[PDB]
Structure 1
Amino acid sequence: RKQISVRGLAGVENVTELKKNFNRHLHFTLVKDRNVATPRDYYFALAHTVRDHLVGRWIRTQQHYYEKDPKRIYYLSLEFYMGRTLQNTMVNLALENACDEATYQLGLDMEELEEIEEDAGLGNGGLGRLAACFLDSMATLGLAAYGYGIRYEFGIFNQKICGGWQMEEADDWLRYGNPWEKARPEFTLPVHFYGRVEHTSQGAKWVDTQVVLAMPYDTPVPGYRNNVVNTMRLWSAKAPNDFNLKDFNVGGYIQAVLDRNLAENISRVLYPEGKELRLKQEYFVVAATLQDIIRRFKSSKFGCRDPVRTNFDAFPDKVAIQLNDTHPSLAIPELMRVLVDLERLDWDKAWEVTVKTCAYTNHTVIPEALERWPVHLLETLLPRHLQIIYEINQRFLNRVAAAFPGDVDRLRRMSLVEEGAVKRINMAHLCIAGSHAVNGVARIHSEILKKTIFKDFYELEPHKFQNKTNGITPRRWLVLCNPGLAEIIAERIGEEYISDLDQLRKLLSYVDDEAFIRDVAKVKQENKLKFAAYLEREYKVHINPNSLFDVQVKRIHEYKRQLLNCLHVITLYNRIKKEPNKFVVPRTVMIGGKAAPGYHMAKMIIKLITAIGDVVNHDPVVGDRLRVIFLENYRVSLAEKVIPAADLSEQISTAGTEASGTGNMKFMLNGALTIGTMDGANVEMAEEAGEENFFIFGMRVEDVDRLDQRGYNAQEYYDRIPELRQIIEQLSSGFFSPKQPDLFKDIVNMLMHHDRFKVFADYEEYVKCQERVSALYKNPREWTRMVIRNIATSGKFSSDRTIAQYAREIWGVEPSRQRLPAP
């Protein structure tokens, strides 16, 4: 027993012990051989050789949190955009240099193998990239945290462009195993759907439920060389498999083969309206988590630390639960029904707990997008939770009456129950009311929350509405994807920046140092060459390495604006062709992101960007002076290839729309210049960088508002501006689509007659700020120094900071970049 220990099983940075484990895993773990193995096979030998090291420190970290029993923090997200784990674990564990030497002497190439990894198909965008950033900060800052989500077998679609139209293939990333996860069938747990609630004697009982099972999966998150490793625990839904003879529902009719497949596809796909499945997913991820939580509260030495009920008095002391946007809101009534009904605390002792345990991050501005289930839907698959949301609600509206007596119309606005045709439950209001700290994700967002969206909630409980500005981690997003820029930053000011990003302001001392200024420049010339190379070798084009890499990687939605960028492209194209011998600084325009199935505007925008691409790229006058590439299937591992490469980062949303913008910061720390309207995270970036270092343009929010107030009439702009006029008529006569003239019709009329987002208004000014971009790029010394200024200022944006601001003002816990001993 004490002889069965984690202890003599490594020597780490040792090429000869990593070579001997690489050989044990190909053979014994994979049961393959060198006569029969593939690159996929050699990646799982190595994936497994790095994994041994990662779980050793996983074991010791978790033992060390049971024995020190700290406050535990549960990040609850319905999306975890991890993406690729091999190089990151080697960079956070110190093994990259020894893995590379050992594989190299085993006659293979790590860069090959690295590129066989499938991106962890668990996210689709922002909301999820961010949780995965915060897990890296959370593990580095010694915190005792947990990521909890649904594990999606089919990710969210793969993008393929066929005839310049987006096709959605499916992502089965799980296709040859995922070497980084450990399936725990032994901790499967019931999740209860439907039923009826029987009020028996001392409580209600939620009886006659269908059950789905929630099976957990453990993937370990390491911290930047601080020897802790925390946990990502994702839940697969699985059918009871009795459906055969056992139950005597069956035998006679197996049409309960439908429970089975409608059980199993809670875990099967990301999304992608008021659908029974979405709410089955939110309940499911929330329910199986809350048990696993309450379990460690009772179990984690606190069984013996009962002093009263294993008291839920010290439950908020040792637990926090973050509900990242309204997607886990039912963890508030689900916690209340476990406490009230299963344990037995009275309603107010349990409420005390709930509101001192839950905190909620908000990431939406337009009210048209806050969460909202119909009540009949809630009646039908969660009876007792619609009961609880009604009691939470009656109390809350009386609290409001203890505060603004006489105001009726406030009661009929701060209710969790919305009236119309179809009464709903407003999950936003739940979340505010059931928690102790609400925080938006940019200062202008948190403040417009307080000021407009959650105002009445601000007046009754002003103390709650915090803010925590969004952040990126310096590891994946500067050490790991841009090792070259990191190298020279360490040459001047050392490592500490990796684990402490405001230290990068020291770089302003070098602003005029010619060595630094040739070195930052060189590293980008490296990074562009390499991406220009991939732009032939996986997908195809003839990129010029010397052009201005202009990139817009943003979700393809109408407000997000690539239609602005297209008209500026067809303005350049048109210019180059009207005077084929003027010097125009050459540009590589690259746009990427995924439409969203069935949003057809979004789909005509992917078809425009490609047809433009087929004309400008193939016309001979334009030479190599302009090219328009659609980067296909944009995703986290493409993002770390292209962001190192870009020199201009098109941030151009109509102002007032964006909330924040985590990839904005990915371009700034990675030596690009942002052109952008003033909104979301452009503001605290411009503010850190000093506005003159930034290409801010366009209407500001107030100007949007005035235009609305007198009403935007898109024909006036169409009638002033002679270029705009022309490009519109080119779309329309099918200059860009000869076979189908009429093909962009709907994009003409969108523009011409119902632009909710004022493309034509920010036109004139947009191109003039581009002229200011072209014009500076044609003087390499000063452009490279504006870049030094954006980079030495990054600091305000590391997720190690945004997290500390969670730790201290919200979870109430202290971060610590202390090495834990280990291995």
Structure 2
Amino acid sequence: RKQISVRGLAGVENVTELKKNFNRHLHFTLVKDRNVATPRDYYFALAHTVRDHLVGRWIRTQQHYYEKDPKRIYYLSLEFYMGRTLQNTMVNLALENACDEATYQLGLDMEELEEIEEDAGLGNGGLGRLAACFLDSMATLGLAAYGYGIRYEFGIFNQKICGGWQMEEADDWLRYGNPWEKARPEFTLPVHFYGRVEHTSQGAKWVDTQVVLAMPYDTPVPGYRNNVVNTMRLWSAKAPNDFNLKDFNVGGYIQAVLDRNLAENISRVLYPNDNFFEGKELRLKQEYFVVAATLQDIIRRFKSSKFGCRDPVRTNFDAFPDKVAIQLNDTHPSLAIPELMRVLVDLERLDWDKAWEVTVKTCAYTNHTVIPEALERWPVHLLETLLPRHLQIIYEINQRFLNRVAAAFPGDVDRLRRMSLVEEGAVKRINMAHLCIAGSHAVNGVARIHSEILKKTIFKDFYELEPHKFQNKTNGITPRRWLVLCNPGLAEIIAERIGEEYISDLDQLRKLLSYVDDEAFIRDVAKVKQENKLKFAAYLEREYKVHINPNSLFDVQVKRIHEYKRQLLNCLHVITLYNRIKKEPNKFVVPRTVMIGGKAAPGYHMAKMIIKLITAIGDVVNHDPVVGDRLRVIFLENYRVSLAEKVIPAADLSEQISTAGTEASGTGNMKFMLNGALTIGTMDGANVEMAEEAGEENFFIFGMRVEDVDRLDQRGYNAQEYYDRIPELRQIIEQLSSGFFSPKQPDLFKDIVNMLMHHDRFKVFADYEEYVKCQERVSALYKNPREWTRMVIRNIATSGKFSSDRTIAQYAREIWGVEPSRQRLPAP
């Protein structure tokens, strides 16, 4: 009753008040004292001091939307890669200063506690950091969004290099809790699995089903310094704990021991695809899961939150596409369409046609691949076993769509078998991308070139039938995470001259273009990067060692360690560089520290191998007494978002070298721009729009473009060919297989040899020379320490297109329909 209210509960900004709230939590929540507490307790102590402050806002923020009924847009994804949370909550919440002070007074080093937190083993690749860039921008722009994905116990693995080879341990990030989550067993929901469909008078029943319980953990995610805080809703699988007797099925036998290990084990570990080992009923089990749970919430909350009031069409969902917006990341939530159709046709009774009008006005799908054999597809043998009613709902969807197609092109019967959701073959499957296009009103590519590719090759019949459903939205980066916390200095001078305004529409960063020439800009920013690198060459010594140099050119590549990313390009050129500098030692050469981070994909052998070669490379060069301090090669173990927040600022040269048109977008790309790095790269994916902003002058675009790559396909790329012109290349395939870079196991990199000389799909030897040589244009510029630094501001001013802020206001305005407020919301 109203004495119970939010109006009082924290004094905020006093150190003071903060030190009392560290004093309560440490003693009363953690129930540890001053004498037996430990650093991990004291970070847990502080997390609660700030979370106090988050949920304050959260509650307000949330009840804001009950009485103000706004459109609620859900960002449905099965990977969400949030990383560290304490610093971020401080900047968005301003408390950082206070927080510091308070723990400095309380006699505790705040940074020493900040690396006691670990990343949310929750996501994994780029597409994760992507919904974690969008989450923060969504809130910021006043937008009512909840993000639903799964909560993973084990995230996805941890990388330890062992004797060269990638060794994977496991992330139980939650071990000792995670303070920012609030689990919720009151809102548990039963997800059905397997079953049987009886069609009777009023509808079909999907009877006899095993069930997995799904129950929700909420994390709040704040806006930037306007006091909105949003709901990340995570699911967790639970085997219904009804074992000794329930259904009086067991007496003699437990297979239930396995229900309670194959139900539960849905949210255990993340599998990320475009790999995995075999399209396991477990991945489809997770994708069905996340969607059944998530949709129940969506309807609980359309009918509830004053829509028992705002009814007015038998709670008919005509109000639904007006109020709800489901945003389908990749094909992985695609079951959201058949399921929304199940719920609606079966469970309420909205005749198929209304609830399909409703479905496509609610749904929208974001494409992330460039290549068509890699679009997800699932076999009718699996959807029939497992999700049978759904299979039926897909066949009868496709009935009708392919009629839509039959009215449209009488007699093109081959397009009728080019549009279908069932791809007849060796084995008959459903193409899950073609489902999304048919139940979403708006499909977008994720970068410029990339949607032109969806429109005129890949989805080109679809675009011909319904042109009006395709769009573009170039992915962004969030300036908070990727400017303010990951480089504080670099945001000080920017506001020191240009002055904050920008961190919520990054385009003002361009003003600092008009500020190039100043002879201080140029020596200051150099100091900053020269601040940052020292710090990294400490990391590269103290907690993971080597003998780096600060003074050096900082050659960074942190990608997925797949083939098509050319990590090997990088290695031919390092050994290039090491061979010359072995021939004429006494020779001035703008030297570098080469750094390659990534994880491989367990079981992808080539990628396991490449890392070994990149480490091995390292024992050899980095311990040779004639290279001295000239080349350095560092494999970056356990690359991840919080290692990314530090590697990106020491880095000079952002290597973005993937074979032309393989990458469909590119996000590491954008952070690498905003913190001042020079970006050598093919015209691919994202370096395209970066180049058309920063201007071609300022980049290191090179290599065989798409045109050329598709022409070396009509011509049969013969590799041994370059082998024979280039004496170096001869000489570096040479040393590898000879046994140079591995005298205890010479033969070893024979694999890679035979990949490169003979079966190289991605055309390494073809882009060699024009790359070796393009590098000599950057090794040009980093002798002349002034001009290097001149390029750099000119890259940096340009960057405000690479704002999640942007990427979001567009989604917001053009699909979601909602207009992105920048309003600071009230609140205690």
TM range (shorter): over 0.9
Q: Is the 2:378–2:432 Cα contact (8 Å) retained in structure 1?
A: yes
Whether the 8 Å contact between 1:237 and 1:267 is mirrored in structure 2 is yes
> For the residues of structure 2 that align with 1:11 and 1:691, how far apart are their CA atoms?
52
Report what 1:180 is aligned to.
Answer: 180
Q: Secondary structure at the match of 2:414?
A: coil
Secondary structure of 2:216's aligned partner: strand
Alpha-carbon distance, 1:435 to partner: 0.9
What residue number does 1:101 align with?
Answer: 101
**Aligned-partner Cα distance in 1 for 2:13–2:100:** 11
Q: CA deviation at 1:522?
A: 1.0
Aligned position for 2:707 = 702
For residue 589 of structure 1, give the secondary structure of its aligned residue in structure 2.
strand
Residues 346-381 of structure 1 deviation map (CA, whole Å, 9 limit, x = unaligned): 011000000000000000011010011000110000
> SS at 2:594's partner residue?
strand
- 1:46, 1:360 → 2: CA distance? 39
Q: In 2, Cα distance between the equivalents of 1:613 and 1:773?
A: 23
CA-CA distance at 1:280 after TM superposition: 0.5
Cα deviation, residue 13, structure 1: 1.1
Q: Tell me if 1:167 matches 2:167.
A: yes
Post-superposition offset of 1:775: 1.2
Structure-1 separation of matches of 2:459 and 2:97: 51
Preserved contact between residue 597 and residue 636 of structure 2 (Cα < 8 Å):
yes
Which secondary structure state, in structure 2, belongs to the residue aligned with residue 754 of structure 1? Answer: coil
CA distance in 2, matches of 1:704, 1:509: 39
Distance in 2 (alpha carbons) for counterparts of 1:33 and 1:630:
41
Counterpart CA distance in 2 for 1:576 and 1:133 is 43
On the 8 A contact 2:218/2:231 being kept in 1, the answer is yes
Q: Which residue of 1 aligns with 2:227?
A: 227
Residue 661 of structure 2 contacts residue 706 of structure 2 at CA under 8 Å; is this kept in 1? yes
Deviation track 1:504-527 (CA, whole Å, cap 9, x = no partner) reads 010011100112212111110000
Q: TM-score, normalised by structure 1?
A: 1.00
For 1:205 and 1:193, the matched residues in 2 are separated by 14
Once the two structures are superposed, what CA deviation does each residue of 1:544-590 show, in whole Å capped at 9, x if it has no partner? Answer: 00000100000000101110000000000001111100101110000
CA distance in structure 1 between the aligned counterparts of 2:642 and 2:779, rounded to whole angstroms: 29
Contact 2:313 2:319 (C-alpha < 8 Å) held by counterparts: no
**Counterpart pick for 1:365 among 364, 370, 375:** 370
Cα distance, 1:246 vs. partner? 2.3
Distance 1:6 1:536 in 2: 48
- CA deviations on 1:723-749 (whole Å, 9 max, x unpaired) are 000010100011000001101010000
SS in 2 for 1:149: strand
Secondary structure of the 1:618 match is: coil
Aligned to 1:55, the other structure's residue is in SS state: helix
**CA deviation digits over 1:152-182, x for unaligned, max 9?**
1001110010001011100000110001000
Q: CA deviation at 1:251?
A: 2.5
* Structure 1 unaligned spans of 5+: none
Q: Is the 1:244–1:254 Cα contact (8 Å) retained in structure 2?
A: no
Q: Corresponding residue for 1:333?
A: 338
CA-CA distance at 1:247 after TM superposition: 2.3
For residues 56-99 of structure 1, give each alpha carbon's deviation from its aligned partner in whole angstroms, at most 9, with x where no partner exists: 00000001111101010100010000000000000000100000
Structure 1 residue 668: deviation in Å? 0.4
| Deviation by residue 1:174-205 (Cα, 9 ceiling, x = unmatched) | 11000100010111100000100011111101
Shift of 1:254: 1.9
Quick check: 1:669–1:794 contact (8 Å CA) kept in 2?
A: yes
- CA distance in 2 between partners of 1:793 and 1:656 (Å): 23
Q: What corresponds to 1:138 in structure 2?
A: 138
Q: Give how far 1:388 is off.
A: 0.3
Partner Cα separation in structure 1 for residue 100 and residue 686 of structure 2 = 38
**SS of match in other structure, 1:187:** coil
Q: Residue 440 of structure 1 contacts residue 449 of structure 1 at CA under 8 Å; is this kept in 2?
A: yes
The 8 Å contact of residues 274 and 374 in structure 1, kept in 2 or not, is answered as no
Q: Deviations over 1:366-406 (max 9, x none)?
A: 10100110001100001100000011100000000110111
RMSD (Å) for aligned C-alpha atoms: 0.6
Offset of residue 499 of structure 1: 0.9
Following TM superposition, by how much is the alpha carbon of 1:759 offset from its aligned partner in structure 2, in angstroms?
0.5
Contact 2:443 2:470 in 1 (8 A): yes
CA distance in 1, matches of 2:775, 2:110: 40
CA contact (8 A) 2:447 2:472 kept: yes
Cα shift at 1:625: 0.7
Residue-by-residue CA offset, 1:307-344 (whole Å, 9 max, x unaligned) = 12212001000010000000000000000000000011
- 2:401 match: 396
Deviation by residue 1:252-300 (Cα, 9 ceiling, x = unmatched): 2122211110001100010043210011100000000001001110011
Q: CA deviation at 1:33?
A: 1.0
Question: Is the contact made by 1:611 and 1:736 (CA closer than 8 Å) also made in structure 2?
Answer: yes
Question: Secondary structure at 1:457's aligned position in 2?
Answer: helix
Matched, 1:792 2:797: yes
Q: Distance in 2 between matches of 1:39 and 1:247?
A: 49
8 Å CA contact 2:378–2:431 kept in 1: the answer is yes
The within-5 A match list for 1:360-509 is 360-509=365-514
Question: 1:536, CA displacement in angstroms?
Answer: 0.7
User: For 2:27 and 2:523, how far apart are their aligned partners in 1?
Assistant: 48
- Segments of 4+ moved more than 3 angstroms: none
TM-score (norm. length: structure 2):
0.99
SS at match of 2:327: strand
Tell me, in whole angstroms, the C-alpha distance in 1 between the residues paired with 2:148 and 2:819.
22
Deviation readout 1:725-784 (Å, 9 max, x if unpaired): 001010001100000110101000000100001100000000111111111000011100
Q: Could you list the per-position Cα deviations for residues 121-169 of structure 1 after superposition, in whole angstroms to 9, with x for gaps in the alignment?
A: 0111111110000000000000000110111100111001000101110
Checking the alignment, whether the CA contact within 8 Å between 1:323 and 1:329 is kept in structure 2 is yes
Per-residue deviation, residues 605-627 of structure 1 (Å, max 9, x unmatched): 00010010101100011011111
- The answer to whether the Cα contact below 8 Å between 2:311 and 2:319 also exists between their aligned partners in 1 is no
User: What is the CA–CA distance in structure 2 between the aligned matches of 1:666 and 1:251, rounded to whole Å?
Assistant: 59
State whether residues 474 and 807 of structure 2, in contact with CA within 8 Å, keep that contact through their aligned partners in structure 1: yes
Deviation at 1:226, TM superposition (A): 1.1
Distance 2:332 2:605 in 1: 26
Moved more, 709-718 or 266-275: 266-275
**Whole-angstrom CA distance in 1 between matches of 2:732 and 2:13:** 60
Contact 1:235 1:285 survives alignment (8 Å): yes
Cα distance in structure 2, aligned partners of 1:508 and 1:802: 23
**Distance across 2 between alignment mates of 1:177 and 1:716:** 58
Distance between the aligned counterparts of 1:446 and 1:350, measured in 2?
A: 29
CA distance in 2, matches of 1:734, 1:43: 49
SS in 2 for 1:33: coil
Within 2, Cα distance between the matches of 1:290 and 1:275?
Answer: 23
- Partners in 1 of 2:731 and 2:8 — Cα distance? 74
Aligned residue pair count: 823
Q: Matches of 1:382 and 1:589 in 2, distance apart?
A: 49
Deviations 1:417-458 (A, max 9, x none): 110121101100000001100000011000010000000000
Distance in structure 1 (CA, Å) of the matches to 2:797 and 2:164: 40
CA deviation map 1:594-649 (0-9, x unaligned): 01000000011000100101011000110111110001000000000000110001
Q: Percent identity?
A: 100
Partner of 1:669: 674
Q: 1:366 and 1:43 mapped to 2: Cα distance?
A: 45
Aligned counterparts of 1:733 and 1:539: Cα–Cα separation in 2 = 31
Stretches of structure 2 that go unaligned for 5 or more consecutive residues are: 273-277
1 CA distance for matches of 2:404 and 2:125?
38
Query: What CA distance in whole angstroms lies between the structure 1 residues aligned with 2:322 and 2:255?
Result: 48
- CA distance in 2: counterparts of 1:772 and 1:34, whole angstroms: 58
Within-5 A mapping of 1:248-397: 248-272=248-272, 273-397=278-402
Output one character per residue of 1:469-494: Cα deviation in whole Å (capped at 9) or x when no partner: 01000000000110010001001111
Give the drift of 1:11.
1.7
**Offset of 1:800 from its aligned partner?**
0.4
1:555–1:595: 8 Å Cα contact kept in structure 2? yes
Give the Cα separation in 2 of the matches to 1:237 and 1:370.
27
Question: 1:656: Cα distance to partner?
Answer: 1.2
Whole-angstrom distance in 2 between the partners of 1:100 and 1:60: 27
